[PDB]
Each structure stands twice: as structure tokens, then as C-alpha cells.
Design a protein around this ligand. Structure first.
Ligand SMILES: Nc1ncnc2c1ncn2[C@H]1C[C@H](O)[C@@H](COP(=O)(O)OP(=O)(O)OP(=O)(O)O)O1
Ligand SMILES: [Ca+2]
Length: 271
DNA sequence: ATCGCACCACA
DNA sequence: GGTAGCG
């Protein structure tokens, strides 16, 4: 309700300022106008944010289908620097943004940090929710450079999803509370930043309303490194004669792309 | 013309 | 509260 109030008050602030093939492809200046269009649309359409030429993090918002988006995106000629918008209150996969500064952390073995993180999360999902999974259900995406160990993990739980990304965040700050206290041996998550201050390997700042999350094969606009399937990745989509593996990987990586299932379990976690 | 949320603060 | 620095 509070969220409903501030969101509409921002829109009040903004008010103060020969058949062709079926294709939906609309751009908007305000992310709220994009969602207005989505609700009005009646086709399974989703919101993307495109970083426009700048150093700025300014975005325009694109509205289309996953299938049509991929069609114009997959060559990586255009639509560089693209972001998934994780809609508030939509069911979503459990995901992670993991990063640490490599010079500031000469001892850290990032590969083992993800493997031990995944194991603890899988134990947490079993103990708290009865969900059984393993690293074979984790899509491992890498955007690392020589300065930064950067990885995105997207869990592919069978017939399971979280109520929305706020609840993913509540679930994570609950199970990571021992780690947040070093600020059952979760010390392997603590890392130094540039200024020597210890933080977590797990970035807790991405579980926010309408969080932008950088697409598979997109780079930040300043940069050249794009998210790509990590070498050690152990999640493999079932192969299909009807879709390319790369499209399979794309759809798995979309946090809001919850597999339509008739037996779906929805996980909640309250603060 | 993006968006939506730790560290200080006063009292 | 009260914001600006962050993601
Ligand atoms: N200025 C911004 N405006 C809107 N959304 C943002 C902004 N900065 C970051 N985000 C969103 C998109 C990012 O994918 C997500 C995680 O932040 P961040 O770690 O800085 O980027 P990243 O994980 O995609 O790349 P990196 O490899 O640099 O860590 O938060
Ligand atoms: Ca990151």
C-alpha cells in the first residue's frame, strides 16, 4: 500500500513535468508507462531496460515478448546493454549477484566460494522449505574482469519459485544472518572492498522493487564484458529440436521467467 | 527523460 | 527522519 502510494505520487510528479506480422515492440521514457502498457496488453509481454548512450545509468524501457526480443537481440549487433526488469510482486526465481574485488582479496578462491555458497543455500532450501536441489540446478553466469570477480547465479527449481524478489531477499538475509554478524562458519563469504571494509560476497542490494538485472550476453554501457555461461556451469537445459540451446539459456537466465507448471510451489519469507 | 532503495541525525 | 550514495 505504501508502495502503491509513492509509485502513483511519482506518476503525479511526472504529470507535473496488407497485414504486417504480429509484433509488439514499444519503447517508453518512464518505466511506469511501460508497466501500464503491459497490464493493458493481453499478450505475454515483459519489460526490458536499455541503457542509452551515456556514462549515466539512464534507461529507456522496452516492451515485447521473450521470443521477439531474442530475435533482434541474439546476433549481439544491437540491443547491447540490456536489463531484465524484475516486476514488483511477480513470482521469480531465486537469484544471486556475487562480486568481490580481486586485488583487495588475493587469497579468495571465487570458484570455491560459489560452490560453498550454493551448498549452504541448498541446505537452507531443504531445511526451511523441503526443496531439494543442487549445483546442477544453478545457472552460473560470469562477468569477471581482472579487477572484479563477478557472477550471476539463477536457480532453476523444479515446480518452485519465490513469491517475489523481496521475499528472495528476506530469505537470504535470514539464512545469511551469521555472515552479517561477522561484519555456522559462513566466514568464507566475507571479503574486503577497495577501502578495506569487510562486506559480503553476496550482494544484498539487488532484491528491490523493479530491480534491473543485466541480461545474459549484455555488458554495462561503459564496458565490454558481457555475462556468459561460466566454464564450471552445471545447469544444462533439456535440448529441444524446436529452440536453440542459446535461447534455452536465455530463458533460464530470466529471473521473472518462472516455468508455467500445474503443481507450482510458491515460497514466501517475511522480515 | 532511470529507478528505488547504510550511515547520520536530532530529539 | 532524511538523504545521497549505491546497486
Ligand atoms: N544505476 C542503475 N540504475 C538502475 N539499475 C541499476 C543501476 N546500477 C545497477 N543496477 C542494477 C542492474 C545490475 O545488473 C544490478 C546489479 O548491479 P551491479 O553489480 O552494479 O551490475 P552487474 O552485476 O550487472 O555487473 P558487475 O559485473 O559490474 O557486477 O543492479
Ligand atoms: Ca554485480
Amino acid at each position: 500500500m505504501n508502495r502503491k502510494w509513492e509509485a502513483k505520487l511519482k506518476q503525479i510528479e511526472e504529470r507535473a513535468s496488407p497485414e504486417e506480422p504480429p509484433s509488439i515492440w514499444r519503447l517508453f521514457h518512464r518505466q511506469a508507462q511501460a508497466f501500464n502498457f503491459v497490464k493493458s496488453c493481453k499478450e505475454d509481454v515483459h519489460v526490458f531496460a536499455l541503457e542509452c548512450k551515456v556514462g549515466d545509468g539512464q534507461r529507456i524501457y522496452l516492451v515485447t515478448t521473450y521470443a521477439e526480443f531474442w530475435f533482434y537481440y541474439k546476433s549481439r549487433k544491437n540491443l547491447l546493454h540490456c536489463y531484465e526488469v524484475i516486476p514488483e510482486n511477480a513470482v521469480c526465481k531465486l537469484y544471486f549477484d556475487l562480486e568481490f574485488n580481486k586485488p583487495a582479496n588475493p587469497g579468495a578462491d571465487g570458484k570455491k566460494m560459489v560452490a560453498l555458497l550454493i551448498e549452504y543455500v541448498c541446505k537452507a532450501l531443504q531445511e526451511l522449505y523441503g526443496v531439494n536441489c543442487s549445483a546442477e540446478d544453478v545457472l552460473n553466469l560470469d562477468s569477471s574482469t581482472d579487477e572484479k570477480f563477478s557472477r550471476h547465479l539463477i536457480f532453476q527449481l523444479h515446480d518452485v519459485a519465490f513469491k517475489d524478489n523481496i521475499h528472495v531477499g528476506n530469505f537470504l538475509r535470514k539464512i545469511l544472518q551469521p555472515a552479517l554478524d561477522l561484519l555456522p562458519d559462513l566466514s568464507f563469504l566475507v571479503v574486503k572492498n577497495n577501502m578495506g571494509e569487510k562486506h559480503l560476497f553476496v550482494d544484498l542490494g539487488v532484491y528491490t522493487r523493479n530491480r534491473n538485472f543485466r541480461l545474459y550476453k549484455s555488458s554495462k554501457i561503459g564496458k565490454r564484458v558481457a555475462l556468459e555461461v561460466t566454464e564450471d556451469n552445471k545447469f544444462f537445459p533439456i535440448q529441444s529440436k524446436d529452440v536453440s540451446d542459446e535461447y534455452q539459456y536465455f530463458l533460464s537466465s530470466l529471473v521473472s521467467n518462472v516455468r508455467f507448471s500445474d503443481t507450482l510451489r510458491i515460497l514466501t519469507c517475511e522480515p
